[PDB]
């Protein structure tokens, strides 16, 4: 049933996983199927059998424990072997990739240079998974985000999604807008005017018939119609004047006074790490899904690794 | 026989392991039984079968190779999988614990903040083993210490234990006094007056009918009645005047001129690392047990991991 | 057939691997046999069975991803378990070795002090593999180098080997000269006069009837008779005057204008890392063997680990 679904055909098999723009609605539907199966297999036996004999190497030039350990644990729970590497940007990336390709069957790469995906494509002779390229894309983060929504709420039809915070530099938002192109959702965008979406991402939303509201304020009416409250970090450097920055924090902080205006079923998401824009007092609330996000990311990356490495 | 003893009931199963004050004489007797079995299993097959399908994550905010690699090797020799994380104290500990709990079935945590155990108790949804909380407790170090004594000398009745060095800041001593509450031992305490035991730990000893001698000098008579010479590091910062500090080093240094006054059967212990308070010239001496300590700690942590994770 | 060849007798079994001067022509012939078998086993099943139940610990005091990950991947592909340690030169090496010997069945050690091999011999109770001792020796690098030549060109009789660059501080060259003592090869040595071989290594070559040419220039005639072009890094510190250093770079740089004077079958080798002394424009050329080197090193280290740990 799982050996079945992994028998199926996919763009993932033997492929680099560098951008969400490589994958179709069907690609992701199959992936999410396999991720449900992965969750069942693990719930019963802990470490499965899919990838005995396969070696994954993780190559992180900047540390991101959530992502690197997620891939480590996914590979090992597939029954594969992992080689975790920590380094910093003097040997070039293309030399390191070609070095490590001789040891492993695939590499997860996170690197401060967004052109790293291009280097990986030109030089690396094994599949590379893009674990973050200068903060431009992080495709499995987009995957696990979409999956989180599906899993927590059921069908995508009818949903209203509210992105809050820094939507200019918040690329996980942009990647997720792309993945939502296939769905009859409405979207609200709460941000200062200085940090609205890039005009082309906004244009992606109006083109799909999805842009509902744009607002600088996180209001009880916006909150009352939110099925999904996807928050982003808002860093002080994005503002010239500190006063502005704190005004915007206090406005956007998800705490109990903010959740009271929400729905009983509102899913609160966050790619993490967070500063104070989601209060700790909310972590135990059923609607707080940002730790369940990471267990969903476990099952999605098991599926992705199974598909890429057969 | 081992599947038998792991069938048995214990406070360890599914529990946080944060303090020695959580465990009874029976708890530790069972643990030591299982540790003897672990040593046999490993002596014959290297990597056992107990914890296939289980994932342990080690989370060390300060490096301690002896402890982190001991737990890595214990888990893997149980047939489980390990995810070793190195980080430093900006994401909070409770967020990191909840992140990693989605990947592993338990976490070993070492952290500079002694309140970390409380954080782990409030937030973490998988068992946490306390690998050292701001140097206040290190329970498996206490376990392997008691086990070391048992293993090297047989029965605890009749023993004289001599703690030497810095007994104020030497908490492994305090934890071990607690674990020795059950035993008819006598204890000698050699330290400067500035670094005697905390009055309550001393009071724990007189209450048990165990305090034999307190001395600022490491004397041939104290040495002649020592079954166990447990040394601690003496750091220069614990003294205002350098002269005092070196006087105390030279007095307490375990070398050949000091061992000659000891028994042929005196077990010399040290939690490690050491500076010069145990001379290298003594390392090959049969009585030098501070490297055998760590192989005993291997078997004890295999037992503890087997019990906690079933 | 592999269980056969590992049944055979070898100086490797249970031995420290510290110097090329420990091993005979037969030792290396057997090793290369087993490495061919390792390549076949892995090509069909990924992770083999040879060393289930064995634990290897890697202990690198300076990072060298190519070497540490090569040994990690070799052990794991033998079916053993690995414990990778990263540290820096306050606990002594002999204390760390004795600590870790209680957890693993062998240790790969790389350390800035060339005397580390002596420390390892005096104190460590498990086999130690020398992964680099203050840049004096790196024996498995020599092994994989010789194997690379054999594999790419067939029989050693008739070959001309040309070492280029910094032959004084290039010890992999010296180790490889030693390993070539058994073979009817000719050797050319291209280097500035300031960086010729040590007189005793040169004397090793004339004693074997092998020194063909010594030159400060990399000439079309030297290139035309090169079967193996083994390049070394040339670092700016080896020259007082920058002008000299760049003159020597430009002279020695392997690029297309330099390869045109070579043979169609010239194997270009490099221990790596490289600066600019092999141009990127050459990496895709069939003759560029410095990434295949590392896959050969994978199979050689699998063989060496299998032999040392039975």
From TrEMBL, chains A, B, C:
> Which positions make up the signal peptide?
none
**Sequence similarity:** In the N-terminal section; belongs to the CarA family. In the C-terminal section; belongs to the aspartate/ornithine carbamoyltransferase superfamily. ATCase family.
Q: What does this protein's UniProt record list under function?
A: Multifunctional protein that encodes the first 2 enzymatic activities of the de novo pyrimidine pathway: carbamoylphosphate synthetase (CPSase; EC 6.3.5.5) and aspartate transcarbamylase (ATCase; EC 2.1.3.2). The CPSase-function is accomplished in 2 steps, by a glutamine-dependent amidotransferase activity (GATase) that binds and cleaves glutamine to produce ammonia, followed by an ammonium-dependent carbamoyl phosphate synthetase, which reacts with the ammonia, hydrogencarbonate and ATP to form carbamoyl phosphate.
Q: What is this protein called?
A: Pyrimidine-specific carbamoyl phosphate synthase-aspartate carbamoyl transferase
Q: Which organism is it from?
A: Chaetomium thermophilum (strain DSM 1495 / CBS 144.50 / IMI 039719) (Thermochaetoides thermophila)
